[PDB]
Write an enzyme that holds these catalytic residues in place. Structure first.
Site, PDB file in Angstrom:
ATOM      1  N   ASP A 138      53.414  15.811  -3.813  1.00  0.00           N
ATOM      2  CA  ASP A 138      54.093  14.825  -2.949  1.00  0.00           C
ATOM      3  C   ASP A 138      53.139  14.493  -1.806  1.00  0.00           C
ATOM      4  OD1 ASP A 138      55.973  13.034  -1.988  1.00  0.00           O
ATOM      5  OD2 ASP A 138      57.463  14.564  -1.472  1.00  0.00           O
TER       6      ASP A 138
ATOM      7  N   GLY B 167      55.004  13.708   3.871  1.00  0.00           N
ATOM      8  CA  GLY B 167      55.819  13.287   4.982  1.00  0.00           C
ATOM      9  C   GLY B 167      57.288  13.613   4.841  1.00  0.00           C
TER      10      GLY B 167
ATOM     11  N   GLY C 113      64.219   8.137  -1.222  1.00  0.00           N
ATOM     12  CA  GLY C 113      65.289   7.854  -0.292  1.00  0.00           C
ATOM     13  C   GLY C 113      66.654   8.308  -0.790  1.00  0.00           C
TER      14      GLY C 113
ATOM     15  N   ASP D 112      61.951  16.597  -9.977  1.00  0.00           N
ATOM     16  CA  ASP D 112      61.514  17.805  -9.306  1.00  0.00           C
ATOM     17  C   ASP D 112      62.642  18.268  -8.397  1.00  0.00           C
ATOM     18  OD1 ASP D 112      60.697  15.840  -6.986  1.00  0.00           O
ATOM     19  OD2 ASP D 112      60.599  17.839  -6.111  1.00  0.00           O
TER      20      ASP D 112
ATOM     21  N   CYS E  25      70.637  30.761 -24.310  1.00  0.00           N
ATOM     22  CA  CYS E  25      69.313  30.695 -23.714  1.00  0.00           C
ATOM     23  C   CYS E  25      68.274  31.494 -24.498  1.00  0.00           C
ATOM     24  CB  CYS E  25      69.360  31.221 -22.278  1.00  0.00           C
ATOM     25  SG  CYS E  25      67.780  31.091 -21.412  1.00  0.00           S
TER      26      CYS E  25
ATOM     27  N   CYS F  37      65.284  32.308 -23.356  1.00  0.00           N
ATOM     28  CA  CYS F  37      64.301  32.847 -22.426  1.00  0.00           C
ATOM     29  C   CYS F  37      64.128  34.352 -22.579  1.00  0.00           C
ATOM     30  CB  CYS F  37      64.720  32.461 -21.005  1.00  0.00           C
ATOM     31  SG  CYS F  37      65.622  33.709 -20.073  1.00  0.00           S
TER      32      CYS F  37
ATOM     33  N   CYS G 139      66.944  36.643 -21.111  1.00  0.00           N
ATOM     34  CA  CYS G 139      68.149  36.611 -21.942  1.00  0.00           C
ATOM     35  C   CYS G 139      67.923  37.309 -23.271  1.00  0.00           C
ATOM     36  CB  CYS G 139      68.564  35.139 -22.096  1.00  0.00           C
ATOM     37  SG  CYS G 139      69.348  34.551 -20.571  1.00  0.00           S
TER      38      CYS G 139
ATOM     39  N   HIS H 132      64.705  33.033 -15.604  1.00  0.00           N
ATOM     40  CA  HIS H 132      65.781  32.438 -16.396  1.00  0.00           C
ATOM     41  C   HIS H 132      66.069  31.014 -15.935  1.00  0.00           C
ATOM     42  CE1 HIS H 132      69.607  31.537 -18.094  1.00  0.00           C
ATOM     43  NE2 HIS H 132      70.036  31.264 -16.875  1.00  0.00           N
TER      44      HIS H 132
END
Ligand code: 0V3
Ligand code: 0V3
Ligand code: ZN
Ligand code: ZN
EC number: 2.4.2.29
Lengths: 342, 342
Positions: A76, A79, A190, A240, A278, A280, A283, A309
């Site tokens: 980014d 600001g 915004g 994000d 899941c 992952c 898990c 996770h």
């Protein structure tokens, strides 16, 4: 691979799925971009410029090397975070279009954001217009700075950021200014600044179709799993958010059945994994009961397991979104998702 | 594999290397036993008895299942930690030989420690003797409790704990009492309680040869890498210590060149791994500079990376000790180690 190429493989309504090709890799869209500290991660421009400094990071070889991440990195422009955590036509003292682009070059990121003004909410029409006008002038300055640095112009990509608060005519004017300048992708700025989901979705309804269809659309700072699904329905390709990461360190886990707070006593004897479906690594091996136990004992291992996770959950959500759009089943998916999550 | 079998493969002076075979696995000795939250890990009897409770852990399937660890687990008997963090011939109110053995059975650990009294330091001869005498009575009670629980007697092992403070005659009396009762292994208790390394080594010099040679010798709560090397020189086979784990979360990394505090500014641009020789996953991928950066930013990832490195360092130390004794080169190793570490 090329410097930047966005290809749409499939559409359903306003939703799209495809790929961004960049020199360091392919990004499958819609994409979730987690903080680095996934096909692309986010670097923390504001933190890094203060510690150790952009120049120091460049001295250490740039952020890819520093972090041990050789895939794309988005940064980014700084600001947003300055306004939130720490003003003139030149920029902000506490950063300018030119300095922001320079910092992002020193960090070595692959997707560079224009330096803008994230208009506070609520804003009057007059104020929203003055702020958006300044951001469009800064967008042209950001374009020119980026183009003046050969290594950056040839290897990275630059996104413009639409402002205009919640006002359709200002959003249109902003979209027009950004398209006349020309960018590799377009962010919707915004939003996620306190307006709430209904209002966010109302603004996205008219704002995203103002952006060039053939380029990626990034909604900055969004968000909760349901925010993401609704934004994809409205034509957004990139996301994000710190929620997965922060939630992780706060006892909150995301599941297909909604968020849960693992510290609650109700989990002390629950032998199920954090989420039943899941895939992952957490898990695969551990129970809610053991993660509860770790977090309550203040073990670092607990917060790490939760964060892992949550980041995996978000990537599983984006995969399901990609597959469902590709298969012509995203409308159904969104409705199925919502039914169960809430 | 048998319930318990200790075999000495090689000796150098008083140092030994070998294996303990147990039903859940082989433990290579000399061994470092890290806290679970390596061939064997330590469970936290004191914590678990309070949260969620030993009975609750048994209800969840015992500690192996709870933790997702199917190898051996050692548990301490709880009173060290009671004395330190929170008295009669029956036990302590705040635990008794019988209740301690029961808790360890409910947890399902493979190596069970007798319930003792870790005599404070300094202690007068009289006080040391009264305390050691009580511990020997509790050791017989611990033996009888363990033997009365068939699942425990047939599948786990019981270690006795020598007391006597720093007094040779009391240590001898304690060793004699424990050998007359009979245990699977013998711990040296009552050290690493503020006496300092020279005094610890002096006591080990006469105390370890009093224990049966053909059984493992465990030095409880030790310790720093140099403490471990010197204790192995004195006939110790097993170690536990929270230093690697606590150091990790405090910015301290162990290296072959000594401990370092990674938060120090001197590391902010150091691109070397935490240790140059370390084979661990952290040292494979990340620099001191990035770990410094993470820890200073308060990122959980930093403390996790440090802890992982420190646990791996300790296991690399024990491997080097094992190999050096096996090869008849441990005297040289210890001297080489010391030269560089300090
Ligand atoms: C939460 N809401 C939200 N965030 C917005 C951002 C920042 C996007 N996220 C950047 C991350 C934040 C966490 C950091 C860490 C760790 C890493 C960077 C924006 N950035 C811009 N420029 N403009 C907007 O209008 C803008 C609007 C935003 N709305
Ligand atoms: C640090 N010094 C030291 N510790 C001693 C212990 C405890 C051994 N470690 C048990 C661990 C501690 C950390 C916990 C966690 C997380 C897990 C258990 C002892 N336990 C006994 N019983 N007797 C001694 O004389 C005894 C003497 C000790 N000296
Ligand atoms: Zn999971
Ligand atoms: Zn290492």
């Amino acid at each position: 691979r090329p410097r930047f190429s966005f290809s749409i493989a499939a559409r359903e309504g306003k939703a799209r799925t495809g790929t961004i090709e960049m020199k360091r890799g392919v990004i499958r869209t819609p994409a979730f971009m987690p903080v680095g500290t996934a096909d692309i991660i986010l670097g923390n421009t504001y933190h890094l410029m203060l510690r150790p400094g952009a120049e120091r990071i460049a001295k250490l070889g740039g952020l890819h090397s520093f972090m041990g991440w050789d895939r794309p990195i988005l940064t980014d422009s700084g600001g947003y975070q300055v306004m939130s955590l720490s003003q003139s036509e030149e920029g902000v003292t506490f950063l300018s279009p030119e300095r922001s682009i320079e910092i992002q070059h020193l960090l070595g990121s692959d997707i560079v954001m224009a330096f803008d003004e994230c208009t506070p909410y609520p804003a009057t029409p007059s104020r929203a217009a003055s702020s958006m006008e300044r951001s469009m002038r800064w967008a042209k300055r950001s374009r020119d700075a980026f183009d003046s640095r050969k290594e950056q112009a040839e290897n990275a990509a630059l996104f413009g950021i639409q402002q205009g608060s919640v006002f359709e005519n200002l959003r249109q004017q902003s979209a027009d200014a950004l398209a006349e300048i020309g960018f590799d992708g377009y962010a919707v700025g915004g939003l996620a600044v306190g307006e709430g989901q209904d209002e966010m979705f109302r603004v996205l309804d008219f704002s995203v179709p103002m952006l060039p269809d053939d380029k990626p659309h990034y909604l900055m700072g969004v968000g909760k799993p349901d925010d993401i699904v609704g934004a994809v329905e409205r034509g957004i390709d990139m996301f994000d958010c710190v929620l997965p990461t922060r939630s992780g360190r706060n006892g909150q886990a995301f599941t297909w059945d909604g968020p849960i707070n693992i510290r609650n006593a109700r989990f002390s004897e629950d032998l199920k994994p954090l989420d039943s479906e899941c895939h992952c690594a957490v898990c695969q091996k551990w129970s809610r009961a053991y993660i509860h136990h770790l977090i309550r004992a203040g073990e670092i291992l607990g917060a790490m397991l939760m964060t892992e996770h949550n980041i995996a959950f978000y990537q599983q959500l984006m995969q399901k979104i990609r597959d469902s759009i590709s298969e012509g089943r995203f409308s159904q998916f969104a409705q199925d998702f919502r039914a169960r999550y809430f």
